[PDB]
Amino acid sequence: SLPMLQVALDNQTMDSAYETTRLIAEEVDIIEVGTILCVGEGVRAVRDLKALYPHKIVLADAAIADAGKILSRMCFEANADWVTVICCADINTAKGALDVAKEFNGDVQIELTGYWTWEQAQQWRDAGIGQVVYHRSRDAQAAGVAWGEADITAIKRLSDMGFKVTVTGGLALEDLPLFKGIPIHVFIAGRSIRDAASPVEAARQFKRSIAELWG
Amino acid sequence: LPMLQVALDNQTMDSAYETTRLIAEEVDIIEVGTILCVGEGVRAVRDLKALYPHKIVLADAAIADAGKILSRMCFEANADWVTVICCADINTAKGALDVAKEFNGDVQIELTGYWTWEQAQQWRDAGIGQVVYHRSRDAQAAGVAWGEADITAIKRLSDMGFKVTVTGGLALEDLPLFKGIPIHVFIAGRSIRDAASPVEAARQFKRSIAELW
Numbered sequence: 001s002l003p004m005l006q007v008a009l010d011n012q013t014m015d016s017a018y019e020t021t022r023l024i025a026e027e028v029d030i031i032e033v034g035t036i037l038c039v040g041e042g043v044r045a046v047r048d049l050k051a052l053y054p055h056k057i058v059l060a061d062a063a064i065a066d067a068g069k070i071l072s073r074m075c076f077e078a079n080a081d082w083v084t085v086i087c088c089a090d091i092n093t094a095k096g097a098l099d100v101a102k103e104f105n106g107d108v109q110i111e112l113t114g115y116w117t118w119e120q121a122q123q124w125r126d127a128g129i130g131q132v133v134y135h136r137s138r139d140a141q142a143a144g145v146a147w148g149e150a151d152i153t154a155i156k157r158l159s160d161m162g163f164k165v166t167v168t169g170g171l172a173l174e175d176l177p178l179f180k181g182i183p184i185h186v187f188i189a190g191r192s193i194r195d196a197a198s199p200v201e202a203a204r205q206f207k208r209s210i211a212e213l214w215g
Numbered sequence: 216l217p218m219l220q221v222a223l224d225n226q227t228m229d230s231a232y233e234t235t236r237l238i239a240e241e242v243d244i245i246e247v248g249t250i251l252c253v254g255e256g257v258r259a260v261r262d263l264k265a266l267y268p269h270k271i272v273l274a275d276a277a278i279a280d281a282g283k284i285l286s287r288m289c290f291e292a293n294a295d296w297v298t299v300i301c302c303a304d305i306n307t308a309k310g311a312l313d314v315a316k317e318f319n320g321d322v323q324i325e326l327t328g329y330w331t332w333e334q335a336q337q338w339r340d341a342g343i344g345q346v347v348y349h350r351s352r353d354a355q356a357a358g359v360a361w362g363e364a365d366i367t368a369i370k371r372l373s374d375m376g377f378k379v380t381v382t383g384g385l386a387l388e389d390l391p392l393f394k395g396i397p398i399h400v401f402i403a404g405r406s407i408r409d410a411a412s413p414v415e416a417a418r419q420f421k422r423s424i425a426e427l428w
């Protein structure tokens with residue numbers, strides 16, 4: 001299947017977010033309420049975005065660290081389809097969020113970061129987690145960290161374990177061929193779409209490139 | 216003496232105010248819980264600091280990435296302190312700290328779930344002076360108790376030079392487990408907010424801390 005495209009709305013206010021969505025809502029598959037938007041506006045951002053775009057998958061990038069059932073329920077009651085749980089959360093946090101996700105016919109992704117282990121990845125699978133987000137951190141990127149070999153190896157191994165893998169972190173169009181040949185579920189682009197001279201054409205470029213590389 | 220912090224793990228400001236109108240003057244630190252950060256957003260920090268400008272306000276944002284951006288949003292809303300989750304990239308913690316210094320604030324690393332001693336030394340090397348030793352709410356709900364391994368870890372963190380906050384379903388009766396350790400802050404959320412008498416609950420915590428330290 002072609003990798004899907006997710007836009008990250010890492011905006012501090014809803015109106016800033018809408019400057020993007022009014023252009024590209026129908027140019028992407030998934031609309032993410034970025035952590036920065038969740039923190040800027042609260043869970044109303046999920047409710048309002050889903051109300052505008054009820055046919056789209058809406059992902060709340062809550063990066064849940066604890067209180068899995070409470071935070072997940074807040075997001076799902078606001079009509080989220082998918083929610084994120086940070087990988088260092090206690091395993092009961094992920095399990096809790098998943099339990100609530102199932103109630104709402106939604107799903108949970110584990111957001112990968114820090115010194116996570118392959119034993120922990122197996123724990124997520126045994127818990128029934130089917131999605132992981134492989135993130136090059138914005139702050140690592142800013143400190144000069146590049147996408148490379150070790151990332152491809154890890155992503156392939158996560159996929160082989162049965163996860164649908166999302167890839168993100170300052171992706172540019174030129175980065176996509178690094179991942180060719182791997183059944184990536186979703187690529188997220190935030191800055192590379194929102195900050196482009198033409199967000200519509202940036203999103204279209206990503207779609208064209210994906211269609212060529214995975215066609 | 217260890218300070219007393221109340222956690223406002225509420226979904227709306229009006230629910231938080233049900234607690235702060237009783238106990239704001241009975242604690243040292245008012246926490247905007249992660250639940251409140253997600254429920255209302257950074258307006259919660261702004262509003263609570265305006266109400267209680269003489270109290271330390273902690274935004275329990277549990278920052279996982281975009282350290283400079285998220286911490287600036289909290290500090291522009293007049294936070295004193297902000298949390299960064301322990302598995303954040305080291306550059307996220309450094310970024311949040313750099314911004315905190317612009318505002319004469321501080322960053323705490325939230326030790327909830329998995330982390331390593333090597334990471335602890337990294338935080339120290341980066342200039343981080345505060346950690347929050349948590350028993351995860353979800354771990355507690357799964358029957359995990361406070362135990363000697365926690366005490367040993369807290370002492371170790373203190374010995375590395377961190378000011379240590381202790382939290383996670385703390386009851387009054389738990390305080391003596393930590394006796395002898397120079398704890399910076401004890402946090403209570405449920406044990407204060409959900410008490411038949413929140414005022415009595417907060418004062419009992421302060422009374423006990425004063426006895427033990």
Ligand SMILES: O=P(O)(O)OC[C@H](O)[C@@H](O)C(O)NO
Pocket residue numbers: 008009010034035061135137138168169170171188189190191192279280281
């Ligand atoms: O493409 P970016 O601007 O890096 O945004 C996507 C990224 O996944 C962010 O939403 C994020 O969650 N960073 O932690």
Ligand SMILES: O=P(O)(O)OC[C@H](O)[C@@H](O)C(O)NO
Pocket residue numbers: 066067222223224248249275327349351352382383384385402403404405406
């Ligand atoms: O005393 P509690 O109800 O456990 O609340 C304090 C705790 O520190 C929470 O604010 C929290 O951050 N749990 O992850």
Ligand SMILES: [Mg+2]
Pocket residue numbers: 008032034035061
């Ligand atoms: Mg995101």
Ligand SMILES: [Mg+2]
Pocket residue numbers: 222246248249275
């Ligand atoms: Mg908290």
